[PDB]
């Protein structure tokens, strides 16, 4: 045989068998923030059946599996690992992750994408051929890791994928549109869509658990031989405030075209993400640049003077590193411009960091407070946002640390959230009452111009 | 354990062979050998689902076989078909048959006994004629839809739902044309056949004068963007969820695509053949009113293929739907069989090593949701002479039997016509799912598969 479609299928079997993804897996439940504090490894490969070239990219999270004496213990009832992980709640909304990791809450996932670029599957027949090949691949090898196929363009980021297990299939599908009927902008319409797609004949259903998250963006901020140091424009650009409802239940509140309970002040958890303005023209990373030996040492002491009160405690080590790095090159015949560029980059990074620190303290007024124990709380809250782009707020909006954030928003209850994220989960016996009870999961993000739904719906292959 | 049991013996089939093959009908020890049966694989066959009649037509000659219960030496009234009628059906010159059908008709008299009124015979010819005979052979109705040859005939009857979720589809009869789809409402057939039979019976005795032949329902769909079509299956009417509606609209359109606030119902057909290999047709239901000697009747609605599986070198040759109407099995000329999920248009499992194979389905209900029903795919390889029982989708080969190389696997796919809900559960007679007819033993057998094996 080995026709072009079969050739593609055989090549996919090879790409999956070489990576040893075949067989069952059993690990440990993921703790909180593993997606963030952990790291993600990746492996690529290339495949092309007739003309079209595809890039197979497998992404996976590091797992320090300690016990290996277990001889792959298997039970009569074994629902796939990814199937259970569909229902995880500890790692909702990771600050940084792949789109599929954020959307489906997955840990290990392969993707078959158009190799290089300038290639896009558009017609429905080609996407259906690719998905058929994927389904036959997983059926033949026995791999349980979800597989995905990029469709439409690259900038639209549409994927369709399947996961398979003994007697169980899971379909990862996604819709991305700009405009919908106004009956889809609240939770009730989303719940109706969820339960309509479920389509279980057992009309009595348990309530669907819902995770609500809102996103607000604030841009306006309202109000001799001396080296000139300082940043003309504001080095920060925008402040992002995310309000998170971690676990609710259907019917506990309402959200429709009339009555809503989604008040940001009542969010039990408050998180803050900041944005850094591009090209923060400073005065000290350019003054010396205009002359690119004497001006190499000026900043060393100048920078030190400004951070004597700030005490960033990074420049000192970086200066010692520069000193050692220059120890043997500061004299090499005809000194090259490489060092000049390296010290320029170090100086501009340090000065930008200290400018942003000052700007942050000035926006949140750490010293604009009489209470030593609160002004200190504020100073420790500030400067922590500079390293990681996500910090918690004490006492949500009720606390004094969050009270200032509340006052800036008021001085600008809260401006319409530029992005709302909903997460719905349920466990029902689809598609017939004599079938297994499987978990259906749906993620939705709504913006002013974007409307994305990503759903993982399960069905029983054995008794449908 | 799986097992196949014999249930009928032909009284005499050599007579039917001799009638349909006149040329077929003492030596000095000449080596006479290489004797095989291919005339059964050449003929058009049909056996009624209720085991009431048999149609076997070769080129333009059709033998009708009728049962007869005979007391054997032990007193058992064993079932034995005996030629009931045999004659030519060609009215024009050069006219040849292309298909045959035996439809039992349910009784309106609320007869608790297992006696359907009669088994109508629906035949399609190369000239473009559809003709309806009775069991005796009397001609009842003759209709010409299109001048092109009649390719296939598929009848849809009534089936009780497995669980509350299962919906119901209208009773229908469809006629496949080279590049056209013709559908006849089953209710119109039920209201015309009876009448015609009553008039003929009354004409036989009362002397009822000839009656102006009433036209039937007739909706001709003009198929498109297809090069060669061999078989078809009527998936029928379906409804879309808002999620599905948005998905399909997004894919068909793009970013600037709009969404309607009233999802339309679309009848789905599937067509195998060449260029493309498989094509999925969707037609707007209720958009065009059904129309009521001329092949030039205006087509009801043009029909263009929305999507399919483009395989030019591939040439499909058959397609059969699962009892639950969720899976289809398609055979190609590369000697391979594929299984498709009709609700998604993708393939699930593709078996290999099956040239000129024949497909069938067996549904088994867990004797006690209501019951853990289970479907099993049957694959008959004639060259190897083997009969295989596969799972509905994935699972080991449940059974494998060695039968003759010249058998035939019959899978009607319908039940007693004209029944409705209350009549079905009140009482129903026996109806089979598949049969295996054998020339060497001149017999008809059935396959039984227990449900428990599925648990594995």
3-state secondary structure chain B: CCEEEEEEECCCCHHHHHHHCCCCCCCCCCCCCCCCCCHHHHCEEEECCCCCCEEEECCCEEEEEECCEEECCCCCEEECCEEEEEEECCCCCCCCEEEEEEEEECCCCCCCCCCCCCEEEEEEECCCEEEEECCCCCEEEEEECCCCCCCEEEEECCCCCCCCCCCCCCCEEEEEECCEEEEEEHHHHHHHHHHHHHHHHHHHCCCCCCCCCCCCCEEEEEECCCCEEEEEEEEECCCCCHHHHHHHHHHHCCCCCCCCCCCCCEEEEEEEEECCCEEEEEEECCCCCCECCCCCCCCCEEECEEEEECCCCCCEEEEEECCCCCEEEEEECCCEEEEEECCCCEEEEEEECCCCCEEEEEEECCCCCCCCCEEEEEEEECCCCEEEEEECCCCCCCEEEECCCCCEEECCCCCCECCCHHHHHHCCCCCCCCEEEECCCCEEEEEECCCHHHHC
B247 to A175: CB separation less than 8 angstroms, yes or no: yes
Please indicate, yes or no, if residue B203 is contained in any of the structural domains: yes
Cβ contact B434:B413 at 8 Å: no
Chain A positions touching B336 (Cβ under 8 A) are: 1
> Cα–Cα distance between B411 and B437 in angstroms, integer?
11
Q: Using a CB cutoff of 8 Å and minimum separation of 24, what contacts does B19-22 make?
A: B19/B61, B19/B63, B19/B86, B20/B56, B20/B57, B20/B58, B20/B59, B20/B61, B20/B63, B21/B58
Kindly state whether residue B30 falls inside one of the protein's structural domains.
Answer: no
Q: Which of A12, A77, A125 to mutate to test the interface with B (most CBs of B within 10 A)?
A: A125
End-to-end Cα distance, chain A: 32
Rounded CA separation B172/B192 (Å): 14
Report yes or no: B255 at the A interface, CB cutoff 8 Å.
Answer: yes
- DSSP-assigned letter for residue A10: H
Residues B373, B377, B379, CA angle at the centre, nearest 5°? 160
Q: Do A3 and B244 touch (CB under 8 A)?
A: no
DSSP assignments along A274-299, one per residue: EEEPS---BSHHHHTGGG--THHHHH
Q: What kind of experiment solved this structure?
A: cryo-EM
Rounded CA-CA distance B382/A176 in Å is 49
On whether the CB atoms of residues B112 and B427 are closer than 8 A, the answer is yes
Radius of gyration for the alpha carbons in chain B, expressed in angstroms and rounded: 23
C-alpha distance from B230 to closest chain A C-alpha (Å) = 20
In the β-sheet with B358-364, what is the strand arrangement from edge to edge?
Answer: B358-364, B374-381, B386-391, B399-402
Nearest-angstrom CA–CA distance, A230 and A322: 22
Selecting from B163, B256, B349 the residue whose C-beta is nearest the C-beta of A433 gives: B163
Cross-chain Cβ contact A125/B246 below 8 Å: no
Q: How many alpha carbons fall within 13 Å on the CB side of residue B12? A: 8
What is the Cα–Cα distance from A266 to A254, expressed in whole angstroms?
A: 15
| Dihedral of alpha carbons B333, B338, B341, B347, sign | negative
Write out residues 38-77 of A within 8 Å (CB-CB) of B: none
Write out residues 340-399 of B within 8 Å (CB-CB) of A: 344-350, 352, 366, 369-374, 392-395
Question: Is B437 in contact with B45 (CB distance < 8 Å)?
Answer: yes
| Residue A132 contacts B, CB cutoff 8 Å | yes
- HSE-CB of B303 using CA atoms within 13 angstroms: 27
Cβ–Cβ below 8 Å for A136 and B246: no
Asked if B252's CB is within 8 angstroms of A197's CB, the reply is no
Residues in chain B within 8 Å Cβ distance of A181: 259, 261
**Parent domain of B329:** 3-24+36-455
In 3-state terms, what secondary structure has residue A101? helix
The reply to whether residue A455 touches residue B243, judged by beta carbons under 8 angstroms, is yes
Nearest Cα of chain B lies from the Cα of A68 at a distance, in angstroms, of: 30
On whether any CB of chain A is under 8 Å from the CB of B258, the answer is yes
Q: Are B257 and A177 an interchain contact pair (Cβ–Cβ within 8 Å)?
A: yes
Please list, in sequence order, all residues whose beta carbon lies within 8 angstroms of the beta carbon of residue A323, skipping any fewer than 6 positions away.
none
Helix ranges (DSSP H) in A365-432: 372-381, 400-411
A10 interface with B at CB cutoff 8 Å: no
Angle at B299 between CA B294 and CA B302, to 5 degrees: 155
CB A452 within 8 A of CB A444: yes
Chain B touched by A155 (CB under 8 Å): no
User: CA separation (Å) from A374 to A366, A394, B431?
Assistant: 8, 11, 85
3-state DSSP of A78-92: CCCHHHHHCCCCCCC
Of B246, B346, B373, the CB nearest to A135: B346
Note whether A136 contacts B: Cβ–Cβ < 8 A. yes
B250/A139 touch (CB, cutoff 8 Å), yes or no: no
H or E stretch including A147?
strand A147-151
Whole-Å CA distances, B453 to A139, A435, B379, B389, B391: 21, 17, 18, 12, 10
Residues with Cβ < 8 Å from B404, sequence gap 6 or more? B385, B438, B439, B440
Q: How far apart are CA A447 and CA A220, in angstroms?
A: 21
Please report whether residue B424 resides in a domain: yes
Q: How far is CA B79 from CA B26, B112, B409, in A?
A: 35, 22, 19
Q: Is A136 left (phi over 0), alpha (psi -120 to 50) or beta?
A: alpha
- Whether the CB-CB separation of A129 and A63 falls below 8 Å is answered with no
Q: Round to whole Å and give the CA distance between B157 and B167.
A: 14
- Residue A252 CB-density burial (10 A; 0-12 exposed, 13-18 middle, 19+ buried): exposed
Give yes or no for B402 touching A (CB within 8 A): no
Instruction: Count CB atoms within 10 A of the CB of residue B169.
Output: 16
Please indicate if any CB of chain B lies within 8 Å of the CB of A432.
Answer: yes
Cβ-defined contact of A193 to B334 (cutoff 8 Å)? no
Instruction: Number of A to B CB contacts under 8 A, please give it.
Output: 115
Alpha-carbon span A167 to A164, nearest angstrom: 8
The string over B189-219, giving b where at least 16 C-beta atoms fall within 10 Å of a residue's C-beta and e elsewhere, is bbebbbebbebbeeeeeeeeeeeeeeebbbb
SS (H, E, C) B119-149: EEEEEEECCCEEEEECCCCCEEEEEECCCCC
Contact between A385 and A95 under an 8 Å Cβ cutoff? The reply is no
Nearest to A421 by CA among A399, A443, A401: A443
Distance CA B233, CA B271 (A): 7
Q: Rounded to 10 degrees, what is the CA torsion of A300, A306, A307, A309?
A: 140
Chain A residues with CB-CB distance to B349 below 8 A = 136, 139
* Residues from chain A contacting residue B376 (CB–CB below 8 Å): none
The span from the CA of A396 to the CA of B309, in Å, is: 55
- In a domain, residue B225? The reply is yes
Q: Is A331 helix (H, G, I), strand (E, B) or coil?
A: coil
Domain count, chain B: 1
Which uninterrupted H or E stretch holds A359? helix A337-364
Residues B279 and B308: beta-carbon distance below 8 Å: yes
Task: Answer whether A437 touches B (CB < 8 Å).
Answer: no
CA–CA distance, A108 with A143 (Å, rounded to integer): 12
B81/A262 Cα distance (integer angstroms):
76
| Closest CB from A123, A173, A180 relative to B259 | A180
Contact status of B310 with chain A (Cβ, < 8 Å): yes
For B385: left if phi > 0, alpha if psi spans -120 to 50, otherwise beta; the answer is left
Residues of A in contact with B314 (CB under 8 A): 3
Residues in chain A within 8 Å Cβ distance of B337? none
- Select from A51, A160, A464 the residue whose CB has the most chain B CBs within 10 Å, as the one to mutate to test that interface: A464
Q: Are B341 and B326 contacting, i.e. CB atoms less than 8 angstroms apart?
A: yes
Handedness of CA B11, B15, B17, B19 (dihedral sign): negative
The DSSP letter of residue A253 is S
Say if B251 falls within a structural domain: yes
Instruction: Please tell me the distance from the alpha carbon of residue B7 to that of residue B154, in angstroms, as a whole number.
Output: 26
Long-range contacts made by residues B13-19, C-beta under 8 angstroms, separation at least 24?
B13/B439, B13/B442, B15/B83, B16/B56, B16/B63, B16/B65, B16/B83, B16/B86, B19/B61, B19/B63, B19/B86
Please give the Cα distance from B149 to B129 (Å, whole number).
Answer: 8
User: Cβ contacts (< 8 Å) between B346 and chain A: which residues?
Assistant: 128, 131-132, 135
Q: Do residue B246 and residue A175 have CB atoms under 8 angstroms apart?
A: yes
Contacts of A372 (CB under 8 A, 6+ apart): none
Which residues from chain B sit within 8 angstroms of residue A463, using beta carbons?
372-374
B window 188-247, beta carbon within 8 A of A? 241-244, 246-247
Residue A19, SS3? coil
Alpha-carbon gap, residue A463 to A458, rounded angstroms = 13
Inform me whether the C-beta atom of residue B323 falls under 8 Å from chain A C-beta atoms.
no
- Strands B61-66 and B435-438, by their bridges, are unpaired
Distance from CA of B367 to the nearest CA of A (A): 13
Q: Cβ contact (<8 Å) for B163 and A434?
A: yes
Instruction: Report the CATH number at residue B107.
Output: 2.130.10.10
For chain B, the maximum distance between any two Cα atoms, rounded to a whole number of angstroms, is 86
Taken in order A134, A139, A140, A145, is the CA torsion positive or negative?
positive
What is the Cα–Cα distance from A406 to A396, expressed in whole angstroms? 10
Are A231 and A281 within 8 A, CB to CB? yes
**Facing residue for B348 by CB, picked from A128, A135, A151:** A135
Does A463 contact B at CB distance below 8 Å?
A: yes
Question: Chain A residue closest to B366 (CA)?
Answer: A434
Q: Which residues contact B112 (CB under 8 A, 6 or more apart)?
A: B427
Bridging pattern class, strands B346-352 and B336-341: antiparallel
From chain B, pick out residues whose CB is under 8 angstroms from the CB of A435. 369
The separation between CA B258 and the C-alpha centre of its own chain, rounded to angstroms, equals 40
Q: Closest Cα partner for A263 from A130, A368, A379, A409?
A: A409
* Torsion of the alpha carbons at B12, B17, B19 and B22, rounded to the nearest 10: -140
Q: CB distance from A308 to chain B under 8 Å?
A: no
Contacts with A444 from chain B: Cβ below 8 Å: none
**B256: contact with A, CB 8 A cutoff:** yes
List the helix and strand counts (H, then E) for chain A: 12, 13
Tally of CB atoms within 10 A around B456: 10
In angstroms, the CA A119 to CA A53 distance is 9
The data reach a resolution, in angstroms, of 3.4
Point out the residue among A128, A176, A462 whose CB comes nearest to the CB of B309: A128
Concatenated DSSP letters of A189-208: HHHHHHHHHH--S----PPP
Where chain A is discontinuous (C–N > 2.5 Å), the residues before each break are 223, 292, 412
| Contact criterion met (CB below 8 Å) for A211 and A267 | no
Distance CA A158, CA A317 (A): 46
Handedness of CA A409, A412, A413, A415 (dihedral sign): negative
């Amino acid at each position: 045989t080995a026709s072009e479609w079969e050739r593609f299928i055989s090549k996919v079997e090879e790409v999956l068998n070489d990576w040893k993804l075949i067989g069952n897996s059993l690990g440990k439940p993921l703790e909180k923030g593993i997606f963030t504090s952990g790291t993600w490894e990746e492996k690529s490969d290339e495949i092309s059946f007739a003309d079209f070239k595809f890039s197979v990219t497998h992404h996976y999270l590091v797992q320090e599996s300690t016990d290996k004496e277990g001889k792959d213990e298997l039970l009569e009832d074994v629902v796939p690992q990814s199937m259970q992980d569909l229902l995880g709640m500890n790692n909702d909304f990771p600050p940084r992750a792949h789109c599929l990791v954020r959307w489906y809450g997955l840990r290990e996932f392969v993707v078959i994408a158009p190799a290089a670029h300038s290639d896009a599957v558009l017609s429905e027949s080609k996407c259906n051929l690719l998905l058929s090949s994927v389904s036959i691949a997983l059926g033949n090898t026995g791999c349980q890791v979800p597989l995905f196929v990029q469709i439409h363009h690259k900038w639209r980021r549409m994927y369709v994928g399947e996961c398979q297990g003994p007697g169980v299939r899971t379909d990862f599908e996604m819709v991305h549109l700009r405009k919908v009927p106004n009956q889809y902008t609240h939770l009730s319409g989303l719940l109706d869509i969820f339960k309509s797609k479920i389509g279980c004949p057992l009309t009595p259903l348990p309530p669907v658990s819902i995770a609500i998250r809102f996103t607000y963006v604030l841009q306006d901020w309202q109000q001799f031989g001396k080296l000139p140091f300082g940043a003309c424009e504001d080095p920060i650009s925008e402040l992002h405030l995310a309000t998170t409802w971690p676990h609710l239940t259907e019917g506990i509140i309402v959200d429709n075209d009339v009555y809503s309970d989604l008040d940001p002040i009542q969010a039990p958890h408050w998180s803050v993400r900041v944005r850094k303005a591009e090209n923060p023209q400073c005065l000290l990373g350019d003054f010396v640049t205009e002359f690119f030996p004497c001006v190499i040492h000026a900043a060393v002491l100048k920078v030190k003077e400004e951070e004597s009160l700030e005490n960033i405690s990074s420049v000192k080590k970086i200066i010692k590193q520069i000193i050692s790095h220059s120890s043997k090159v500061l004299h090499f015949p005809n000194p090259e411009d490489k060092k000049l560029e390296e010290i320029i980059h170090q100086i501009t990074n340090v000065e930008a960091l200290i400018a942003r620190a000052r700007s942050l303290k000035a926006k949140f007024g750490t010293e604009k407070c009489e209470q030593e124990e609160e002004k200190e709380d504020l100073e420790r809250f500030v400067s922590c946002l500079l390293e990681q782009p996500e910090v918690l707020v004490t006492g949500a909006g009720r606390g004094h640390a969050g009270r200032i954030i509340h006052k800036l928003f008021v001085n600008a209850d809260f401006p319409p959230p530029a992005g709302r994220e909903f997460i719905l989960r349920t466990t029902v016996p689809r598609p017939a009452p004599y079938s297994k009870a499987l978990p259906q999961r749906m993620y939705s993000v709504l913006t002013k111009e974007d409307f994305r739904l990503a759903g993982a719906f399960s069905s029983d292959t054995s008794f449908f | 354990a799986c097992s196949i049991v014999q249930f009928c013996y032909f009284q005499d089939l050599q007579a039917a062979r001799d009638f349909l093959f006149p040329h077929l009908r003492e030596e000095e020890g000449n080596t006479c050998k290489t004797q095989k049966t291919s005339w059964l694989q050449d003929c058009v066959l049909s056996l009624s689902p209720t085991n009431d009649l048999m149609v076997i037509a070769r080129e333009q000659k059709a033998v009708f076989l009728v049962p007869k219960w005979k007391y054997s030496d032990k007193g058992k009234e064993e079932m034995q078909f005996a030629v009931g009628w045999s004659g030519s059906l060609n009215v024009e010159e050069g006219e040849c048959v292309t298909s045959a059908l035996c439809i039992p008709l349910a009784s309106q008299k609320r007869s608790s006994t297992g006696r359907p009124d009669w088994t109508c015979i629906v035949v399609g010819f190369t000239s473009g004629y559809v003709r309806f005979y009775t069991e005796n052979g009397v001609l009842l109705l003759a209709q010409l839809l299109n001048e092109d040859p009649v390719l296939q005939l598929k009848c849809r009857t009534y089936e009780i739902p497995r669980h509350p979720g299962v919906t119901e589809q209208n009773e229908e009869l469809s006629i496949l044309y080279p590049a056209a789809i013709v559908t006849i409402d089953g209710f119109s057939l039920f209201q015309s056949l009876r009448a015609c039979r009553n008039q003929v019976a009354k004409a036989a005795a009362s002397g009822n004068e000839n009656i102006q032949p009433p036209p039937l329902a007739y909706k001709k769909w003009g198929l498109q963007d297809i090069d060669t079509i061999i078989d078809h299956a009527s998936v029928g009417i379906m409804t879309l969820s808002p999620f599905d509606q948005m998905k399909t609209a997004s894919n068909i359109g793009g970013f600037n695509a709009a969404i309607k606030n009233s999802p339309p119902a679309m009848s789905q057909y599937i067509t195998v053949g060449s260029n493309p290999f498989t094509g999925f047709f969707y037609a707007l239901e209720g958009s065009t009113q059904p129309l009521l000697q001329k092949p030039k009747v205006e087509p009801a609605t043009p029909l263009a293929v929305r999507f399919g599986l483009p395989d030019s070198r591939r040439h499909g040759e058959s397609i059969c739907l699962s009892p639950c109407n969720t899976l289809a099995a398609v055979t190609d000329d590369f000697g391979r069989v594929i299984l498709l999920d009709v609700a998604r248009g993708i393939a699930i499992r593709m078996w290999k090593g099956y040239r000129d194979a024949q497909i069938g389905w067996i549904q088994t209900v867990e004797d006690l949701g209501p019951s853990r029903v289970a479907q099993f795919l049957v694959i008959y390889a004639p060259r190897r002479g083997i009969l295989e029982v596969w799972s509905t989708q994935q699972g080991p080969r449940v059974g494998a039997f060695n039968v003759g190389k010249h058998c035939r696997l019959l899978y009607p796919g319908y039940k007693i016509m004209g029944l409705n809900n209350v009549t079905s559960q009140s009482w129903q007679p026996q109806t089979y799912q598949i049969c295996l007819v054998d020339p060497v033993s001149g017999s008809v057998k059935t396959v039984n598969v227990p449900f428990h094996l599925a648990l594995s």
